[PDB]
Amino acid sequence: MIYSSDLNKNLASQIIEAGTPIPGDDVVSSLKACYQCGTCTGSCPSGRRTSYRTRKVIRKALLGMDDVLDSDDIWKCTTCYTCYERCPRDVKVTEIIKTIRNLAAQKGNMAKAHKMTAMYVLKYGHAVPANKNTAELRKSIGLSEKAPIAQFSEKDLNEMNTLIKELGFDELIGFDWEKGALK
Amino acid sequence: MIYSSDLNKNLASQIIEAGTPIPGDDVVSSLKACYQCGTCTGSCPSGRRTSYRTRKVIRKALLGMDDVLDSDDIWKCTTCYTCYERCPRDVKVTEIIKTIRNLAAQKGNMAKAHKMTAMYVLKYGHAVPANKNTAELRKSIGLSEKAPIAQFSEKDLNEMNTLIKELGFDELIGFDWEKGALKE
Ligand code: SF4
Ligand code: SF4
Ligand code: SF4
Ligand code: SF4
Protein backbone atom coordinates (compact mmCIF):
# COMPACT_ATOMS: atom_id res chain seq x y z
CA MET A 1 0.00 0.00 0.00
CA ILE A 2 1.53 3.27 -1.17
CA TYR A 3 -0.31 6.43 -0.19
CA SER A 4 0.31 10.05 -1.23
CA SER A 5 1.63 10.87 2.27
CA ASP A 6 4.53 8.44 1.70
CA LEU A 7 5.60 10.03 -1.61
CA ASN A 8 7.78 13.12 -2.23
CA LYS A 9 6.35 15.06 -5.21
CA ASN A 10 9.71 16.91 -5.60
CA LEU A 11 12.09 13.90 -5.59
CA ALA A 12 12.49 14.09 -9.41
CA SER A 13 13.20 17.86 -9.26
CA GLN A 14 15.54 17.30 -6.34
CA ILE A 15 17.53 14.84 -8.48
CA ILE A 16 17.62 17.31 -11.38
CA GLU A 17 18.76 20.19 -9.12
CA ALA A 18 21.48 17.92 -7.60
CA GLY A 19 22.61 17.27 -11.17
CA THR A 20 22.82 20.99 -12.00
CA PRO A 21 25.21 22.37 -13.20
CA ILE A 22 27.25 19.13 -12.98
CA PRO A 23 26.59 17.07 -15.07
CA GLY A 24 23.95 19.53 -16.25
CA ASP A 25 20.21 20.27 -16.32
CA ASP A 26 19.63 18.73 -19.77
CA VAL A 27 21.53 15.57 -18.82
CA VAL A 28 19.72 14.72 -15.62
CA SER A 29 16.30 16.00 -16.71
CA SER A 30 16.43 13.13 -19.23
CA LEU A 31 14.95 10.88 -16.51
CA LYS A 32 11.64 12.63 -17.17
CA ALA A 33 11.59 11.03 -20.68
CA CYS A 34 11.81 7.39 -19.44
CA TYR A 35 8.79 5.31 -20.58
CA GLN A 36 9.56 2.28 -18.41
CA CYS A 37 10.35 -0.04 -21.34
CA GLY A 38 12.84 -2.15 -19.36
CA THR A 39 15.65 -2.05 -21.91
CA CYS A 40 17.93 -0.84 -19.10
CA THR A 41 17.06 -3.76 -16.76
CA GLY A 42 17.56 -6.40 -19.49
CA SER A 43 20.92 -4.84 -20.35
CA CYS A 44 22.11 -4.61 -16.71
CA PRO A 45 24.77 -7.20 -15.79
CA SER A 46 24.23 -6.71 -12.06
CA GLY A 47 20.48 -7.41 -12.42
CA ARG A 48 21.38 -10.88 -13.73
CA ARG A 49 22.66 -11.83 -10.22
CA THR A 50 20.60 -9.61 -7.82
CA SER A 51 17.21 -8.03 -7.06
CA TYR A 52 18.47 -4.76 -8.66
CA ARG A 53 16.16 -3.46 -11.44
CA THR A 54 17.49 -0.36 -13.19
CA ARG A 55 13.99 0.55 -14.46
CA LYS A 56 12.46 0.66 -10.98
CA VAL A 57 15.00 3.23 -9.78
CA ILE A 58 13.81 5.62 -12.43
CA ARG A 59 10.21 4.65 -11.56
CA LYS A 60 10.63 5.31 -7.82
CA ALA A 61 12.28 8.64 -8.69
CA LEU A 62 9.36 9.74 -10.88
CA LEU A 63 6.80 8.47 -8.38
CA GLY A 64 8.47 10.04 -5.33
CA MET A 65 9.74 7.04 -3.39
CA ASP A 66 12.51 8.52 -1.22
CA ASP A 67 13.44 5.02 0.00
CA VAL A 68 15.31 4.71 -3.31
CA LEU A 69 18.04 6.92 -1.78
CA ASP A 70 18.36 4.49 1.14
CA SER A 71 18.41 1.44 -1.14
CA ASP A 72 21.52 -0.73 -1.52
CA ASP A 73 20.25 -1.46 -5.06
CA ILE A 74 21.52 1.87 -6.50
CA TRP A 75 25.03 1.02 -5.25
CA LYS A 76 24.97 -2.27 -7.20
CA CYS A 77 25.35 -0.41 -10.54
CA THR A 78 28.89 -0.76 -11.97
CA THR A 79 28.46 2.25 -14.31
CA CYS A 80 29.14 0.15 -17.41
CA TYR A 81 26.98 2.65 -19.44
CA THR A 82 25.25 -0.24 -21.27
CA CYS A 83 21.78 1.03 -20.34
CA TYR A 84 22.81 4.56 -21.29
CA GLU A 85 23.85 3.30 -24.73
CA ARG A 86 20.68 1.31 -25.49
CA CYS A 87 17.85 3.48 -23.99
CA PRO A 88 15.55 4.46 -26.87
CA ARG A 89 14.38 7.62 -25.01
CA ASP A 90 17.93 9.15 -24.56
CA VAL A 91 17.74 8.79 -20.79
CA LYS A 92 21.21 9.48 -19.38
CA VAL A 93 20.59 6.52 -17.06
CA THR A 94 24.14 6.04 -15.79
CA GLU A 95 24.48 9.73 -15.07
CA ILE A 96 21.13 9.83 -13.28
CA ILE A 97 22.11 6.94 -10.99
CA LYS A 98 25.36 8.73 -10.03
CA THR A 99 23.38 11.88 -9.22
CA ILE A 100 20.88 9.83 -7.25
CA ARG A 101 23.90 8.42 -5.32
CA ASN A 102 25.02 12.01 -4.70
CA LEU A 103 21.75 12.65 -2.88
CA ALA A 104 22.11 9.32 -1.07
CA ALA A 105 25.59 10.36 0.11
CA GLN A 106 24.17 13.67 1.37
CA LYS A 107 21.54 11.70 3.35
CA GLY A 108 24.42 9.78 4.96
CA ASN A 109 24.06 6.55 2.97
CA MET A 110 27.75 5.84 2.20
CA ALA A 111 29.79 2.69 2.81
CA LYS A 112 32.86 2.82 5.02
CA ALA A 113 35.21 1.39 2.33
CA HIS A 114 33.98 4.19 0.06
CA LYS A 115 34.55 6.91 2.71
CA MET A 116 37.97 5.31 3.32
CA THR A 117 38.89 5.52 -0.38
CA ALA A 118 37.71 9.18 -0.38
CA MET A 119 39.89 9.81 2.72
CA TYR A 120 43.04 8.43 1.05
CA VAL A 121 42.69 10.95 -1.82
CA LEU A 122 42.10 13.69 0.75
CA LYS A 123 45.11 12.62 2.86
CA TYR A 124 47.57 11.13 0.31
CA GLY A 125 45.98 12.49 -2.88
CA HIS A 126 45.50 8.94 -4.22
CA ALA A 127 42.91 6.11 -4.04
CA VAL A 128 45.68 3.48 -3.82
CA PRO A 129 48.68 5.21 -2.17
CA ALA A 130 52.26 3.86 -2.48
CA ASN A 131 53.46 1.45 0.26
CA LYS A 132 56.96 0.38 1.41
CA ASN A 133 56.89 -2.40 -1.26
CA THR A 134 56.09 0.16 -4.02
CA ALA A 135 59.41 1.95 -3.47
CA GLU A 136 61.31 -1.37 -3.66
CA LEU A 137 59.30 -2.63 -6.65
CA ARG A 138 59.60 0.57 -8.71
CA LYS A 139 63.37 0.57 -8.04
CA SER A 140 63.92 -3.08 -9.05
CA ILE A 141 62.15 -2.47 -12.41
CA GLY A 142 63.96 0.68 -13.49
CA LEU A 143 61.68 3.57 -12.53
CA SER A 144 61.86 6.45 -10.05
CA GLU A 145 61.55 5.17 -6.43
CA LYS A 146 58.72 7.69 -5.95
CA ALA A 147 56.44 8.49 -8.94
CA PRO A 148 55.91 12.15 -10.00
CA ILE A 149 52.44 12.31 -8.43
CA ALA A 150 50.64 14.51 -5.87
CA GLN A 151 51.44 11.99 -3.09
CA PHE A 152 55.07 13.17 -2.83
CA SER A 153 54.30 16.83 -3.66
CA GLU A 154 52.92 18.85 -0.76
CA LYS A 155 52.05 21.80 -3.03
CA ASP A 156 49.56 19.65 -5.00
CA LEU A 157 48.36 17.92 -1.79
CA ASN A 158 47.54 21.29 -0.19
CA GLU A 159 45.79 22.51 -3.34
CA MET A 160 43.37 19.57 -3.02
CA ASN A 161 42.73 20.35 0.66
CA THR A 162 41.84 23.93 -0.29
CA LEU A 163 39.40 22.78 -3.00
CA ILE A 164 37.91 20.04 -0.78
CA LYS A 165 37.23 22.49 2.05
CA GLU A 166 35.58 24.94 -0.35
CA LEU A 167 33.54 22.13 -1.96
CA GLY A 168 32.49 20.81 1.46
CA PHE A 169 33.57 17.28 0.52
CA ASP A 170 35.23 16.94 3.94
CA GLU A 171 31.90 17.78 5.65
CA LEU A 172 30.09 15.35 3.35
CA ILE A 173 32.33 12.41 4.24
CA GLY A 174 32.35 13.62 7.86
CA PHE A 175 36.10 14.16 8.11
CA ASP A 176 37.68 15.82 11.23
CA TRP A 177 40.81 17.72 10.14
CA GLU A 178 42.52 17.79 13.57
CA LYS A 179 42.08 14.05 14.32
CA GLY A 180 42.64 13.05 10.69
CA ALA A 181 39.84 10.47 10.89
CA LEU A 182 36.14 10.19 10.00
CA LYS A 183 33.06 10.62 12.24
CA MET B 1 16.74 -14.67 -14.10
CA ILE B 2 13.98 -16.73 -15.68
CA TYR B 3 15.03 -19.06 -18.47
CA SER B 4 12.88 -21.14 -20.83
CA SER B 5 13.94 -24.36 -19.04
CA ASP B 6 12.23 -23.10 -15.86
CA LEU B 7 8.89 -22.42 -17.61
CA ASN B 8 6.02 -24.80 -18.52
CA LYS B 9 4.51 -23.75 -21.83
CA ASN B 10 1.47 -25.93 -21.23
CA LEU B 11 0.65 -24.59 -17.73
CA ALA B 12 -2.16 -22.39 -19.15
CA SER B 13 -3.62 -25.36 -21.12
CA GLN B 14 -3.21 -27.56 -18.08
CA ILE B 15 -5.34 -25.10 -16.08
CA ILE B 16 -7.98 -25.02 -18.81
CA GLU B 17 -8.07 -28.85 -19.00
CA ALA B 18 -8.41 -29.06 -15.21
CA GLY B 19 -11.38 -26.68 -15.51
CA THR B 20 -13.10 -28.81 -18.17
CA PRO B 21 -15.96 -29.76 -18.06
CA ILE B 22 -16.37 -28.24 -14.56
CA PRO B 23 -16.67 -25.24 -14.50
CA GLY B 24 -16.28 -25.41 -18.27
CA ASP B 25 -13.86 -24.74 -21.14
CA ASP B 26 -15.28 -21.28 -21.94
CA VAL B 27 -15.09 -20.24 -18.28
CA VAL B 28 -11.50 -21.15 -17.54
CA SER B 29 -10.16 -20.30 -21.01
CA SER B 30 -11.07 -16.71 -20.10
CA LEU B 31 -7.62 -16.40 -18.44
CA LYS B 32 -6.19 -16.20 -21.97
CA ALA B 33 -8.02 -12.82 -22.40
CA CYS B 34 -6.34 -11.12 -19.39
CA TYR B 35 -4.36 -8.01 -20.47
CA GLN B 36 -2.64 -7.45 -17.14
CA CYS B 37 -4.49 -4.21 -16.32
CA GLY B 38 -4.32 -4.69 -12.55
CA THR B 39 -7.99 -3.98 -11.84
CA CYS B 40 -8.12 -7.34 -10.04
CA THR B 41 -5.16 -6.50 -7.72
CA GLY B 42 -6.55 -3.06 -6.79
CA SER B 43 -9.92 -4.67 -6.00
CA CYS B 44 -8.45 -7.54 -3.93
CA PRO B 45 -8.98 -7.17 -0.16
CA SER B 46 -6.29 -9.73 0.67
CA GLY B 47 -3.72 -7.84 -1.45
CA ARG B 48 -4.06 -4.82 0.82
CA ARG B 49 -2.47 -6.82 3.70
CA THR B 50 -0.14 -9.25 1.89
CA SER B 51 2.30 -9.78 -0.97
CA TYR B 52 -0.59 -11.49 -2.93
CA ARG B 53 -1.17 -9.85 -6.31
CA THR B 54 -4.12 -11.33 -8.20
CA ARG B 55 -2.72 -10.09 -11.54
CA LYS B 56 0.60 -11.91 -11.12
CA VAL B 57 -1.13 -15.29 -10.64
CA ILE B 58 -2.68 -14.93 -14.06
CA ARG B 59 0.69 -13.68 -15.36
CA LYS B 60 2.64 -16.65 -13.96
CA ALA B 61 -0.02 -18.97 -15.44
CA LEU B 62 0.31 -17.45 -18.91
CA LEU B 63 4.11 -17.34 -18.68
CA GLY B 64 4.47 -20.91 -17.38
CA MET B 65 5.67 -20.42 -13.81
CA ASP B 66 4.73 -23.72 -12.15
CA ASP B 67 5.84 -22.32 -8.76
CA VAL B 68 2.45 -20.57 -8.71
CA LEU B 69 0.90 -23.98 -7.81
CA ASP B 70 3.25 -24.25 -4.83
CA SER B 71 2.55 -20.67 -3.70
CA ASP B 72 0.68 -19.88 -0.47
CA ASP B 73 -0.50 -16.70 -2.25
CA ILE B 74 -3.25 -18.54 -4.23
CA TRP B 75 -4.69 -19.85 -0.94
CA LYS B 76 -5.04 -16.28 0.37
CA CYS B 77 -7.88 -15.55 -2.08
CA THR B 78 -11.21 -15.44 -0.14
CA THR B 79 -13.30 -15.93 -3.31
CA CYS B 80 -15.15 -12.64 -2.80
CA TYR B 81 -15.67 -12.45 -6.63
CA THR B 82 -14.84 -8.69 -6.61
CA CYS B 83 -12.14 -9.11 -9.27
CA TYR B 84 -14.47 -11.31 -11.30
CA GLU B 85 -17.09 -8.54 -11.22
CA ARG B 86 -14.79 -5.69 -12.28
CA CYS B 87 -12.45 -7.29 -14.90
CA PRO B 88 -12.98 -5.46 -18.20
CA ARG B 89 -11.84 -8.52 -20.23
CA ASP B 90 -14.48 -10.96 -18.76
CA VAL B 91 -11.78 -13.05 -17.08
CA LYS B 92 -13.50 -15.51 -14.73
CA VAL B 93 -10.71 -14.71 -12.24
CA THR B 94 -12.27 -16.29 -9.14
CA GLU B 95 -13.09 -19.46 -11.03
CA ILE B 96 -9.58 -19.62 -12.49
CA ILE B 97 -7.99 -19.38 -9.03
CA LYS B 98 -10.15 -22.27 -7.76
CA THR B 99 -9.10 -24.37 -10.74
CA ILE B 100 -5.48 -23.41 -10.17
CA ARG B 101 -5.96 -24.62 -6.54
CA ASN B 102 -7.33 -27.89 -7.94
CA LEU B 103 -4.01 -28.46 -9.70
CA ALA B 104 -2.15 -27.40 -6.54
CA ALA B 105 -4.10 -30.00 -4.58
CA GLN B 106 -3.16 -32.67 -7.16
CA LYS B 107 0.52 -31.71 -6.69
CA GLY B 108 0.04 -32.35 -2.95
CA ASN B 109 -0.14 -28.70 -1.84
CA MET B 110 -3.05 -28.94 0.63
CA ALA B 111 -3.24 -27.79 4.24
CA LYS B 112 -3.95 -30.33 6.95
CA ALA B 113 -7.00 -28.45 8.31
CA HIS B 114 -8.40 -28.49 4.77
CA LYS B 115 -7.67 -32.23 4.34
CA MET B 116 -9.29 -32.75 7.76
CA THR B 117 -12.44 -30.85 6.76
CA ALA B 118 -12.59 -32.98 3.57
CA MET B 119 -12.22 -36.13 5.72
CA TYR B 120 -15.15 -35.19 7.97
CA VAL B 121 -17.50 -34.97 4.96
CA LEU B 122 -16.13 -38.30 3.74
CA LYS B 123 -16.54 -39.95 7.18
CA TYR B 124 -19.53 -38.13 8.74
CA GLY B 125 -20.91 -36.47 5.60
CA HIS B 126 -20.50 -33.01 7.15
CA ALA B 127 -17.82 -30.28 7.48
CA VAL B 128 -18.85 -29.57 11.09
CA PRO B 129 -20.28 -32.86 12.46
CA ALA B 130 -22.51 -33.02 15.54
CA ASN B 131 -20.84 -33.69 18.92
CA LYS B 132 -22.22 -34.76 22.32
CA ASN B 133 -22.98 -31.06 23.10
CA THR B 134 -24.99 -30.70 19.85
CA ALA B 135 -27.52 -33.33 20.97
CA GLU B 136 -27.95 -31.54 24.33
CA LEU B 137 -28.08 -28.06 22.75
CA ARG B 138 -30.60 -28.97 20.01
CA LYS B 139 -32.81 -30.58 22.68
CA SER B 140 -32.74 -27.60 25.08
CA ILE B 141 -33.82 -25.23 22.26
CA GLY B 142 -36.76 -27.21 20.90
CA LEU B 143 -35.43 -29.11 17.88
CA SER B 144 -34.86 -32.78 17.04
CA GLU B 145 -31.92 -34.22 19.07
CA LYS B 146 -30.41 -35.38 15.75
CA ALA B 147 -31.00 -33.25 12.61
CA PRO B 148 -32.42 -34.87 9.43
CA ILE B 149 -29.03 -34.93 7.69
CA ALA B 150 -26.71 -37.50 6.04
CA GLN B 151 -24.72 -37.84 9.31
CA PHE B 152 -27.43 -40.02 10.92
CA SER B 153 -28.42 -41.77 7.66
CA GLU B 154 -26.07 -44.55 6.52
CA LYS B 155 -27.79 -44.81 3.11
CA ASP B 156 -26.79 -41.22 2.24
CA LEU B 157 -23.34 -41.64 3.84
CA ASN B 158 -22.66 -44.75 1.70
CA GLU B 159 -23.86 -42.96 -1.45
CA MET B 160 -21.14 -40.33 -0.88
CA ASN B 161 -18.48 -43.03 -0.38
CA THR B 162 -19.48 -44.56 -3.73
CA LEU B 163 -19.24 -41.21 -5.53
CA ILE B 164 -15.97 -40.27 -3.76
CA LYS B 165 -14.30 -43.54 -4.76
CA GLU B 166 -15.41 -43.10 -8.37
CA LEU B 167 -14.27 -39.45 -8.37
CA GLY B 168 -10.91 -40.39 -6.83
CA PHE B 169 -11.32 -37.74 -4.13
CA ASP B 170 -10.12 -40.28 -1.54
CA GLU B 171 -6.90 -40.84 -3.54
CA LEU B 172 -6.48 -37.06 -3.93
CA ILE B 173 -6.67 -36.37 -0.19
CA GLY B 174 -4.60 -39.53 0.39
CA PHE B 175 -7.20 -41.32 2.51
CA ASP B 176 -6.69 -44.99 3.57
CA TRP B 177 -10.12 -46.67 3.86
CA GLU B 178 -9.02 -49.49 6.22
CA LYS B 179 -7.18 -47.25 8.73
CA GLY B 180 -9.73 -44.44 8.37
CA ALA B 181 -6.95 -41.82 8.41
CA LEU B 182 -4.89 -39.79 5.92
CA LYS B 183 -1.38 -40.47 4.54
CA GLU B 184 1.50 -37.92 4.89
S1 SF4 C 1 15.40 2.30 -20.95
FE1 SF4 C 1 15.40 4.37 -20.79
S2 SF4 C 1 13.29 4.14 -21.15
FE2 SF4 C 1 13.31 1.98 -21.21
S3 SF4 C 1 13.26 2.15 -19.10
FE3 SF4 C 1 15.38 2.09 -18.92
S4 SF4 C 1 15.08 4.11 -18.73
FE4 SF4 C 1 13.00 4.30 -19.07
S1 SF4 D 1 25.07 1.07 -15.83
FE1 SF4 D 1 24.64 0.75 -13.80
S2 SF4 D 1 22.67 0.33 -14.61
FE2 SF4 D 1 23.09 0.88 -16.55
S3 SF4 D 1 23.75 -1.09 -16.78
FE3 SF4 D 1 25.77 -0.91 -16.20
S4 SF4 D 1 25.06 -1.30 -14.21
FE4 SF4 D 1 23.07 -1.73 -14.90
S1 SF4 E 1 -8.41 -7.60 -14.37
FE1 SF4 E 1 -9.05 -9.09 -15.70
S2 SF4 E 1 -7.52 -8.35 -17.06
FE2 SF4 E 1 -7.07 -6.70 -15.78
S3 SF4 E 1 -5.68 -7.97 -14.76
FE3 SF4 E 1 -6.97 -8.81 -13.37
S4 SF4 E 1 -7.38 -10.17 -14.96
FE4 SF4 E 1 -5.88 -9.45 -16.29
S1 SF4 F 1 -11.59 -13.00 -5.49
FE1 SF4 F 1 -9.85 -13.89 -4.56
S2 SF4 F 1 -8.74 -12.43 -5.69
FE2 SF4 F 1 -10.43 -11.79 -6.80
S3 SF4 F 1 -10.53 -10.36 -5.24
FE3 SF4 F 1 -11.84 -11.48 -4.01
S4 SF4 F 1 -10.05 -12.29 -3.11
FE4 SF4 F 1 -8.75 -10.93 -4.18
Side-chain angles (χ1 to χ4, degrees), chain A residues 20-72:
Chain A
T20 313
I22 303 160
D25 198 297
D26 290 19
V27 166
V28 182
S29 296
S30 69
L31 58 93
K32 300 175 87 197
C34 156
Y35 53 15
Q36 295 284 294
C37 76
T39 301
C40 53
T41 307
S43 297
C44 184
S46 297
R48 303 226 304 280
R49 27 225 125 190
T50 54
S51 67
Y52 174 51
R53 305 281 180 272
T54 322
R55 184 199 39 89
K56 280 188 181 183
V57 173
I58 312 300
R59 185 73 197 93
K60 285 189 181 209
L62 288 152
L63 188 73
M65 277 198 244
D66 282 356
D67 56 88
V68 75
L69 303 169
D70 307 302
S71 79
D72 288 23

